[PDB]
Symmetry: D4
Subunit: 182 residues, 8 copies
């Protein structure tokens, strides 16, 4: 259709857990991330325009900034680690997948894809991970269950992450059918 790119950035720490392999150690990854959101629009109606100081980018930015100065962990990580995570940072995000630049590109696609119910369609997300590389998601990657199924209830944002939202009920509104931009 018509290609739109929108640029976001965030600063993050996240956990990669290990194998039971004897050489595989657990690691944490604080990096700078850059995010290209790639949209295709068949229609530039006002309700799905994306621009600063408007509502719809306001929600996408608020979800995307949730990962900024937050830590991300897997749901199925060991609960001693997860409890040390929540002590570590009051900004924490619980993910249904192990956090990576790879899965961030799937997660940010899905979050933007869910927000765009309010034509305008998420085409792709590229997440650049510092100077070491990028991951690019497409639509097939989102519905890939071998990659790990993404539902809105599988991403759990912290209270303090919700504390900085413009609307505190933003994410719960999209868990229901509640249509965003009248």
């Amino acid at each position: 259709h018509m290609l739109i790119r929108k640029l976001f950035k965030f600063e993050n720490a996240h956990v990669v857990r290990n194998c039971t392999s004897d050489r595989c150690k657990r690691s944490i990854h604080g990096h700078s991330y850059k995010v290209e959101l790639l949209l295709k629009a068949s229609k530039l109606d006002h309700g799905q325009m994306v621009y600063d100081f408007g509502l719809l980018k306001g929600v996408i930015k608020d979800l995307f900034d949730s990962f900024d100065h937050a830590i991300c962990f897997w749901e199925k990580d060991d609960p001693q680690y997860i409890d040390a995570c929540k002590t570590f940072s009051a900004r924490w995000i619980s993910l249904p997948v192990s956090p990576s630049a790879e899965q961030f590109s799937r997660i940010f696609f899905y979050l933007a894809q869910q927000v765009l119910q309010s034509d305008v369609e998420v085409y792709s997300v590229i997440v650049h991970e510092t100077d070491t590389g990028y991951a690019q998601s497409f639509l097939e990657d989102i519905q890939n269950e071998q990659m790990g199924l993404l539902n809105l209830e599988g991403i759990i944002f912290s209270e303090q992450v919700q504390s900085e939202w413009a609307d505190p009920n933003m994410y719960e509104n999209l868990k229901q059918g509640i249509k965003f931009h009248n």
Copy 2:
């Protein structure tokens, strides 16, 4: 065919009007824009060559520089706003669409497409909007009526915008059939 890119830039303020949604506020957007004009040429005859200090780029640059240190508003905006716009800036442009980076890429495509009647064909326009992203138009986007139909009489340039043209009758010449480069 053969790909030509030509680079333009302009500095602009424009209006995005709001919904009747209770949270949707009106916003103004002063930014730096960069413009990639993408041409395909089957023939490098002199009359549709594009180069500095020649006539045909002279007209495309003059139309493109119309948006520089100008304000852009929608035709169907509220007339108190539109009259405040014309008081605000003697460089003003009235648009048949709400101004955005998205619609600039359609508008600049169409303006360049209309100028190239004087082979050489506008392929695409990319408008980069400061560091926050870009919109890319193709030919399907121009004739999309859901995006908003573009005619030459729907873009109204200010007197003071016309004041800086190399030819004051440039735009009126293209409203008629008047063929540009003999």
Copy 3:
């Protein structure tokens, strides 16, 4: 003798009395000198002190700017235009932005403001030092002659934080 640079951007419209209207992307370098590194004057993102400084600096972003001493019936047309406006005690330019941003950051703050660089699109920059702030020939800066709008003040973390700053608190 610690040099700290902190980096800001904003996207602004403003006026100069042809009278001319200026929509540009801006970049700010805020240059600080430090000799304590005590926590109350620390500049870092998700704490408090840079939160004041970034709120005052992002106040200029998607707002228009005008002179006080511009003609009144264009000042209404400035603030009919959108509810993000800042009234300025000098005529807004990138030269005057570098003085104003220096003055705002200095009033917030042993961290002192050494210099402010404001880049205006690709056409260059202005760099204020402290001596530029102390000219009445460049236009004297006090706090109350900068007036932010009601909806500029809406976006701030504390909406009262400018009105605090003009008092002791």
Copy 4:
């Protein structure tokens, strides 16, 4: 009066007491002055002396950093979190990174350390000089108050090389 710049990167998490957690890409410029260019003080990649300096500097990479004087039960949560940790004698920031990296490089080394620039993502930098290292107001730096973890020390070419440095050898 030879200026040498050597360039380093690292990817770090750290803490500041809202208390806030900071994951950033960092860049280091290490600025040296030289007047001998004798081989034992030479800084070059696959030899020895920059091998000490890069090992100490890459120690900060995919590790977390915390204060000594942070609360103990969050310090356990800092080092439950991963086995790459560094205990620091000041509260970690990019300002304090520029002092610490200066101090580590100076202790390694006629090459002396002139300045260290540490860039924190795209939000700017801090630049230490020697006078910044000699403030107790900024937090006094000795070698033993920096504690690297057991697995930070694992990655080094000699794992003993810090414990050598605190002695004469």
Copy 5:
């Protein structure tokens, strides 16, 4: 096949002649040019490897550097201009097309295409013209007679341009069948 890009640069002045249109003026264009040579190789034999301090890139560089600190004019320009060109610069190149960034990309393609007789194939040339844009040639553009047919005898290099060649008979060797890299 396998994509190879090789980067060249040159500094040039050239003539664009005008119409008999009353507003169309003659112009000269001194610019910095950057050149991407795009090769596809099915075979990395030694004789058509391209690398510094080898023979085959040596010839391609020598032809490409012919345009550096040279002036380019059209063959069919007015002979008073052409004679003023040869007085102006002892480095001059006579071209069978009007010189432009557009035609440079065709000319450099053709020159590299002719040199690669000595598998390895010119895919494309991109000529970037200062900060104002680029032209990209493909193989269809070379054999386009509407763009202007390119033969080796239609490009005439100056004596002083030939003076800087590693081999003075390089270009005459390729006018014959003389195979380059034994």
Copy 6:
């Protein structure tokens, strides 16, 4: 002690007596010092004063440049070549461009010209200061020894504005 940089580009051909012909993209940094910021000396795009400066600077763009003291029968061949020419009182180079652009901007203008940097393609730059303008060893600069062509003068906003500048007005 306000530093202002304004940025310009131009695309030029010129001559040096092998005699050699030079077609390059150029970038100009114009460095100004300011202590008034009064409106008549203000440098900004769509007003007036930078309109003089950019017209004189864009005069060099898609024009050829030659020495006065070049041989006459190549000077005709210089201005047979195109009607955009500038006669120069020194032999044109990027070194002499930085002096000439300094001199033109100084004659236009409390803003004074501090320095001019002219970058010649990717091969480097020349940076004039005021002391470079005051050498007869570098070639003395007066206004009338720079001669713009008839069609260089055609493109200007006022075509008379150079001939104004040589007088008081």
Copy 7:
């Protein structure tokens, strides 16, 4: 599938041998190289995730860093040269092809392709050679016998190159079937 790029760099010297052509001289090439590894992943399981301070990138980095501050020569070079190579640098690599940016892109593809036996697939390698250009390998280039067949036993790493590996038996493990990440 899903595109992953991972960035590597190395600093290298290598030999290009000559023809029996009278003008073809032997040359050595010390350069800075930048390496884009392009992966396609159908599955982000832990065992073929690529990330710093994990095992699988650890091996790919260790093989890639083998070329850093090493010299590369052809197996079929003259043995006086090869023996002068091994005297010259205790970090040396013997290659079954003549070393170039072109063949590095094939070699690095193949090495990464062999390491990914432990879904995740090497798509492409781009090797940028200083500021002068790049070579891009795809899968067809690897199995091209006209380009020169790549087997693990044809790349011989020096003892001192092996000395810096995290595992000294890494390369021998992949010569056997020994599966890497349990």
Copy 8:
């Protein structure tokens, strides 16, 4: 007080006594000061004086470099390796490249060499000044202790031009 920068690149291998072998892309900034701008000392591309300087600087490109005082039987292996070699009177590094390139450019040349910056890949740079050239502690530089090879000397515009420089001519 004219600053001129001219920019050069070269792609080099060299040795340091693990003994380590170094293949890097290099960038050179040559910084000059000027007060005459007379034509015989002019630095510009397709004339003569930069032709000497670029030939001497491109001599380092796709050549190996070694110490004089390296062991002989590795010096044969250095110049068995290719016929582009340069014998150096100091051990080659980017620090010593900045001194050598300074010394070569100074000997060629009122233009004097102010400084030379040599950047070694992405790991940083060394910047020589004149005082660095006048240390015997850094290794004294004379012209004859730099020996270019027979085929390095082959590529030059005059192959004799170094052997001219060591004499008066």
